[PDB]
Amino acid sequence: MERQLEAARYRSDGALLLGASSLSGRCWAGSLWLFKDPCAAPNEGFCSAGVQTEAGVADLTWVGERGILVASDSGAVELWELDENETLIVSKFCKYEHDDIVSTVSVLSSGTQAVSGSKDICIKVWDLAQQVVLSSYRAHAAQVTCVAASPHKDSVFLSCSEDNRILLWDTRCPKPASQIGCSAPGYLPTSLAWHPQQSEVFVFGDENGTVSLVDTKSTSCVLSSAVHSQCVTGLVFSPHSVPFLASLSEDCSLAVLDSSLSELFRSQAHRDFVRDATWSPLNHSLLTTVGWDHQVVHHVVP
Amino acid sequence: RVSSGRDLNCVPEIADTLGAVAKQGFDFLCMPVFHPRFKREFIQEPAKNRPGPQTRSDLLLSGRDWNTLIVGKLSPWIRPDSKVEKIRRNSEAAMLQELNFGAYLGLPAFLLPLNQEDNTNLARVLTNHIHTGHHSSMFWMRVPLVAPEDLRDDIIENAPTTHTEEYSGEEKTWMWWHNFRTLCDYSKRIAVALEIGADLPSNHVIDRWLGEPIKAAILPTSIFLTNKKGFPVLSKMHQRLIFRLLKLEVQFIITGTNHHSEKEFCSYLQYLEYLSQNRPPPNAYELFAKGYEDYLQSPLQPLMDNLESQTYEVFEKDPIKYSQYQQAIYKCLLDRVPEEEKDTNVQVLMVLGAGRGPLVNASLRAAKQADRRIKLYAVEKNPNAVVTLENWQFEEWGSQVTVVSSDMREWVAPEKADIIVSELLGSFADNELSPECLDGAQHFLKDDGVSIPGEYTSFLAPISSSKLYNEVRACREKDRDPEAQFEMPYVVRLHNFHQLSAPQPCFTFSHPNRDPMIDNNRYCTLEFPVEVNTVLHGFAGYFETVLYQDITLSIRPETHSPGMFSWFPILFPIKQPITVREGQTICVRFWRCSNSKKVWYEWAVTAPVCSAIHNPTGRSYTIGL
Amino acid sequence: RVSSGRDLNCVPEIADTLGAVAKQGFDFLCMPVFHPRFKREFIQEPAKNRPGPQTRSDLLLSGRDWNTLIVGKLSPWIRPDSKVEKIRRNSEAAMLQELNFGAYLGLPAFLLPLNQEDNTNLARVLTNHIHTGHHSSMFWMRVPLVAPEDLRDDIIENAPTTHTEEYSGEEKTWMWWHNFRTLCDYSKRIAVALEIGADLPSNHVIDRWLGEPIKAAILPTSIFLTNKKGFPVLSKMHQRLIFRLLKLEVQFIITGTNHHSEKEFCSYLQYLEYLSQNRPPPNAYELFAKGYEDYLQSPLQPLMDNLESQTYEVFEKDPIKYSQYQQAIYKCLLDRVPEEEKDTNVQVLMVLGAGRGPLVNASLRAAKQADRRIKLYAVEKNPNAVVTLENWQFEEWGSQVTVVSSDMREWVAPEKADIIVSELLGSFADNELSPECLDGAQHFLKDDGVSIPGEYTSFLAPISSSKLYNEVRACREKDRDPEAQFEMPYVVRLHNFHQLSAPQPCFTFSHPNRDPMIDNNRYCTLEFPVEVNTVLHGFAGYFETVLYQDITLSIRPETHSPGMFSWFPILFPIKQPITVREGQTICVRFWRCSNSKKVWYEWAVTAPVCSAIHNPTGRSYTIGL
Amino acid sequence: RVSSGRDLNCVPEIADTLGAVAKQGFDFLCMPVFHPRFKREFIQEPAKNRPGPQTRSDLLLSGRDWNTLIVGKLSPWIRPDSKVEKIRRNSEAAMLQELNFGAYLGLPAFLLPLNQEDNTNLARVLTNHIHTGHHSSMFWMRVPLVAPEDLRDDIIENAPTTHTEEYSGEEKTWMWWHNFRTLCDYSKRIAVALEIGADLPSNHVIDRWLGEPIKAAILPTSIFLTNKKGFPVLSKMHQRLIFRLLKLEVQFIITGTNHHSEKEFCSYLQYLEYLSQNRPPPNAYELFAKGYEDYLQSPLQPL
Ligand SMILES: CCc1cc(NC(=O)C(=O)N2C[C@@H](C)CC[C@@H]2c2ccc3sc(C4CCN(C)CC4)nc3c2)cnc1N
Ligand SMILES: CCc1cc(NC(=O)C(=O)N2C[C@@H](C)CC[C@@H]2c2ccc3sc(C4CCN(C)CC4)nc3c2)cnc1N
Ligand SMILES: CSC[C@H]1O[C@@H](n2cnc3c(N)ncnc32)[C@H](O)[C@@H]1O
Ligand SMILES: CSC[C@H]1O[C@@H](n2cnc3c(N)ncnc32)[C@H](O)[C@@H]1O
Ligand SMILES: [Cl-]
Ligand SMILES: [Cl-]
Ligand SMILES: [Cl-]
Ligand SMILES: [Cl-]
Ligand SMILES: [Cl-]
Ligand SMILES: [Cl-]
Ligand SMILES: [Cl-]
């Protein structure tokens, strides 16, 4: 396996999905892995399925239970299908419609469409069944840092880029994008996370290590907390009814926050950037994190 | 054809990628030297101590491949101008690391992006890197023709793209470059990689880049329209732009993924080649003067210096101008000698400045074409050319031509001349002191005599060319004024520049000059209307001469004699470039001064802002009598 | 092979003569531009007004033929230094005329003769011509190896040729040149066309011309001996001289009529070609360094500057030196670890200054050759080479090699080293500050530890090379001391020079240096015996180094390691050349100074005459710590 | 106190005039080297051949007097920037003649006027004169604080003086200087002789000249108000300006005839001296650092 682990996503039945890349050395490629034994990761020997991609992987997301959506460095969006035996991983399609690196992907609520953001300033909507791009938007003025599909609406999603714009979308509207000024022109947004229960509320991290809670109704920065010392790379809510919020950062630390953005758990276990973190559907207090130190850490949250 | 390269931000195997782009026909490859997403920390632990290797090894390619085929790219996560202090300090070290590794590989060029107004700290770090160990490193500044904010789709509900006119704002992307280019003190190792988008702006936004050091033009695959068969093509405006760029001889860089997936990557490059081949082939003038494009040469001084042989040789290879001289002499002969006196009236015809004898042969051909008698004098002060003249006179001309080896201002003629034919003009007409020479030679001209040329006039026009400005600036020599190179003209085949106003006449001389109070000193003021914002760097100079009646010669672009390649335009630069806005008027002053020994030009801009008086007392440039 | 030309003083038809000399195989032709017997008067009438043409026309050849094939010759009747005033002024005018015509033709070279002691006015006129309308014109000074007076037959009754010893007089023909060369202030456009006579003088008279700009060697047909078959050949001494000249890559010029009349003119040129082919083929060292002959380069500073990739590459392409290092490490391993401890005793072996890892591989090979265990540290402060080191360590070396990316003077080692291996030496041994680096790295060396190299020593030798002196003189740059180029050393493959005394050791350093009062400052005085008359222009510098016991490296010409091409010699020049006579001793002083930040060399000649102290306070050259 | 000079355009006897201005207390005298109305022709005959002498002799004063006491003045008829080509060519030679004679006398300074926007050819001729034989010659550019057009009385019926605000226009007289100063490439031998009028402009027009090489301040007798006793005084704003100029240590030049005819010429200079003495005496800081005013020194490096 390549050193730099990028994505860790739990499947509903408990299986863990890993997406890794090699960001140094002779080869700059990537790989996908499925582990039905979670504690066996990242060891390639005790593995359930594995595949080597031509190029690295920037973001990753599940498509149901057998589909794996990949944003590639090659500018491609790639759908890999899982084998009948769930021992092989085969490329269902690989479309080169983005010009630069595809840096983020997110599946819409219906599970039949997806949204992708790329370093080519563009954002693209995809019909996964037809394997085509329905809509292509150029709403930002800098590289798109994150796209996050709404869990409840198939026409709504959030996006954030280095042009300091946070955009709420509604593909039904003629002008789908809408800028959320929050408080006032602050630091660049880097991560987005919808609230699982309330559809009017979300959270975003910035490059200065601050995580903020915003309500679209009030269109104003409801809350903000200086959680990390460096850029915030990911925000993932817990599946429980009372949602815990895991925050990742380039300071090599993980933080767990409550409703009021107060710090609960904190792990210095990673000695490199923390890339992804997913909660186990079999134990809603277990949280699996990955990083560029090739380390897969399982945390127990009180 | 086209020199070109492929821009990729994804390189899994450097050897396989290079082989692929070579088989696709590309000449070079722009690629990242570190992985684009592999952000690095230089201050705070633990990521500070990330174990290497930090990138791929330099052994994977030969030194020649690094030197010729690989163009480095700054990683997109490096933000030297971030409002966050931590990110700024970290990106400083990251940019230094990547630039130092690019120089370590010996790469011919390194791409750095400009996509906001404030690139001050980026410019500071790059300027410090340039002055830390002098190398042959070149730097291409990726500047978009249209800013990404002014290219976005109008799909934001509460942030609409304003549909109103903004002249200066539409050019902001150049301002960026300009400021950056000014912050680095006009480094010759910093150039432009102009990126072209889907929507092309107004023609003035494009003309803005005239006179700028554009080494590369970046075309994405997104801007290519699809053909009926499925091939990639471009709009007619994009094609006009491609031709304009091909004239500047820039390298074209394809970026983005292949969207015309039925074909190969060869299709985009093939469209570019097909455009390049289907351009009108080079005419004789452009064919000869293609190598002289923007080549700075000092003005010749045929009076003070004796010209070499090959200089006269390139003068003689110009059939258009000698045909013009022959026709003028023919018409003058017909107008002076009636038909009933063709065998009784012989004309005294003196060639003042004969060279190696092209004007003598032209006079003979005109005489036999007009069916008249002429006695020829070939006056030349260059004895090395007098050798050629006397060999010609012995072997061919005979006693009809009398060779006179002296200066026309000193020669005591045995008889007075009906016609005097001279070739003493320069690029600025009188910059080689034809007025003084023909004035000294005027006493042996008959009272009803004719001078060919009968008149000449100089023309000036303000130009913008940061390229030529930096070329002049690089002419600083030891043991003289550090700014003397700006206070002297240069004969140059102008290219990659921008005329800012229509040429206007400067100085005019007439021969013969019956005036009692003869004075060749001149003082002229010129007001040039400017319709566009730009930066004045100097003044182009041309001339027009009337040889006889409607027979004229000219290098002035509007009335340029077709196919004549004896003179190139001249250039009077200025020390400091002058910002000019739309509607402003460039007012320039020009003096032609002289004493007993020297003649020189002084000039100074008075509007929209004053400059220093250039070449005062001819301290930097003089023309010897 | 040989580039050559034919010298003729009789040219009836220039085209026929050029075609003949071309079909004979010659590359160029030395011919008069005016008829040799056609004396011209410039002052007194009536001959002053002689009707032209004064010579043949410039139309008779193409510009390329004038530029490449024709070498001009000064007419023999021109005597600028005549005792008669009239002849002096007339010859001034004629010499100016002929030189100006040669420049008008664009000739690549122009021959002027030196055949007496006083050529002062000739030098004055030529110097004025050089500084009047400067072109790329080159001038060959025809100087005979032996004066015609000292070659004449002893057939004058009342004027016998003295058969006694005169060391200085036998070299008078060089003095001529020297004086002339000094009068023209060492013009780069003035060179030597050494004419070789029948009798060759003593070896010192010939060695006099070592270090002089010899562009041409003139051979007459009279000096050629006749072969058994009837072909022309030369004596063994003449052939030795021909080989010595071929090393300098001079052009050979045949003069005189064909005396071996049975054959063609091809025979002389064919003998020269046959000599050129039958020379020992180029050795690898000379093959690589042929292009570097007398090329001045600034010394590398691997400590202050991070070296580029291809520099490390040329360092690694040297199998002899790495074989030597491997053998030294092998012997040290054997001497430190007994046979009965080969599997129990593991050695700490630190490569300080690892580069891209040739010494690491050498250490591994030496370990497996000696059958011993080693743990390797690869210390390197250049991060760009640390990239290569870490790629090697990941892909090949494994955990056996630990790469350390820091300075050896700052690194806090985890364990102490049994052996430390370094290649921090320069051309002058310590000019790259190997002593300071190895002193800072000495604390993590074991009490009984070994340093490879264990010792090194620098060597100096006075040299004579007006060529290299003028090359250094031409390194003057704007914005600094006009004489700073003389106060700094240059790494250069020495060629066309003359060592004046056997090299003597200058500075010596030993590692480890257990001395309590460590001081790397040095002050050395050197007395070099000189057996010949010459002119000191600078001091060549070499080094020897003991890596371990009898394993040594050396660029010193006497003990030079065979086939090693990692270092070229160094050169410390002086501002003013110093005349040295036979028997005199050149006493030079050298200082190695330093402060907290910089190390530099100061030097000054004290005998036979004092010079200025060069590079005081390192004002012109410093080596950064 | 005050270093000062007297500006006269009428000098019948140079010795008598110099003695008079010396007895009046002045330190120098600005006077014409050629008669102001004695226009000369350099091209067209017959006036081209006007018999000499063209001016008074250089023997009439000692070399020291020429070096220290006499400031030359360009004749007012010389118009190098005239729209008429003949007048332009003639004034070029006239200006060269007068400048060369001033340098021949070894005068410490030479006054030249700026009273229009276009002084380009004037600047060209002066720049050529500066670079023709290097001397210690200094040149004072007479620039009015307010242009004569913006100072005239509103007494023209069909050409009224506009009573509206114009910020940049009110400073035009500096622009002139600036352009001139830029055309001569910032010559150290070219300075300002700021002329002060009756009406003082806005404070920004005055502040404009902060940081400019003002060597002389020209005061006419017309701007002096009359005292109850009959002496000459100035307004409070004029006095503030005089203090500001005294801080810069400029030389004050009195021009115009004596209008307070009951007194002598000593009265104007006495008012200036009385203003200079009645200024707060130098404190310790200014006393120590008076010589260090605008003295460039490299920064110390005690480490
Ligand atoms: C028709 C009559 C005529 C023509 C001209 N025309 C020009 O001068 C002119 O535009 N060009 C530009 C182009 C056409 C080439 C020719 C000539 C030009 C200009 C500048 C230099 S410098 C230079 C080097 C020569 C070798 N040496 C050792 C160093 C100086 N050679 C040239 C040659 C001027 N005068 C008269 N009378
Ligand atoms: C074995 C270990 C070793 C060797 C040496 N040897 C030398 O230096 C030396 O003799 N040569 C001469 C020949 C063999 C070639 C290599 C090297 C040399 C010297 C001077 C310069 S200047 C230069 C330019 C490069 C391009 N950049 C942009 C500008 C500077 N490149 C060189 C290269 C010194 N030190 C140590 N440690
Ligand atoms: C054809 S370029 C102009 C020619 O006129 C010659 N020429 C220029 N000035 C004079 C002069 N005053 N008298 C004679 N020939 C001249 C030059 O030497 C050159 O051959
Ligand atoms: C093989 S050329 C000399 C090598 O030693 C390295 N070097 C020189 N001085 C030091 C030092 N003080 N610490 C570490 N490496 C050094 C240089 O970077 C270069 O790679
Ligand atoms: Cl422009
Ligand atoms: Cl353009
Ligand atoms: Cl005309
Ligand atoms: Cl002689
Ligand atoms: Cl230095
Ligand atoms: Cl100001
Ligand atoms: Cl003020």
Author numbering:
A (entry chain D): 27 to 328
B (entry chain C), C (entry chain A): 13 to 637
D (entry chain C): 13 to 315
Copy text verbatim from the article accompanying this structure deposition:
PRMT5 plays an important role in the regulation of diverse cellular processes via dimethylation of target proteins involved in splicing regulation, cell cycle progression, apoptosis, the DNA-damage response, and other functions. It has been shown that PRMT5 inhibition by small molecules can selectively kill cancer cells with homozygous deletion of the MTAP gene if the inhibitors leverage the consequence of MTAP deletion, namely, accumulation of the substrate of the MTAP protein, methylthioadenosine (MTA).4−6 MTA is a weak, endogenous inhibitor of PRMT5 that binds competitively with S-adenosylmethionine (SAM). Compounds that bind PRMT5 cooperatively with MTA, and not with SAM, can selectively inhibit PRMT5 in MTAP-deleted (MTAP-null) cells and kill those cells while sparing normal (MTAP WT) cells, since normal cells have functioning MTAP and therefore low levels of MTA. Targeting MTAP-null cancer cells via selective inhibition of the PRMT5·MTA complex can improve tolerability relative to nonselective PRMT5 inhibitors8−11 by limiting inhibition of PRMT5 in normal cells.
With the addition of the N-methylpiperidine, these compounds generally showed excellent potency and improved metabolic stability relative to the unsubstituted benzothiazole series, and with TNG462 we had identified a compound that met the potency and selectivity requirements of the program and had good in vitro metabolic stability. However, accurate measurement of Ki is challenging as the apparent initial rate is close to the background control in which no enzyme is present, therefore the Ki of TNG462 can only be estimated to be ≤300 femtomolar. TNG462 was also profiled for off-target activity against a panel of 39 methyltransferases at 1 and 10 μM and showed no significant activity other than with PRMT5·MEP50.
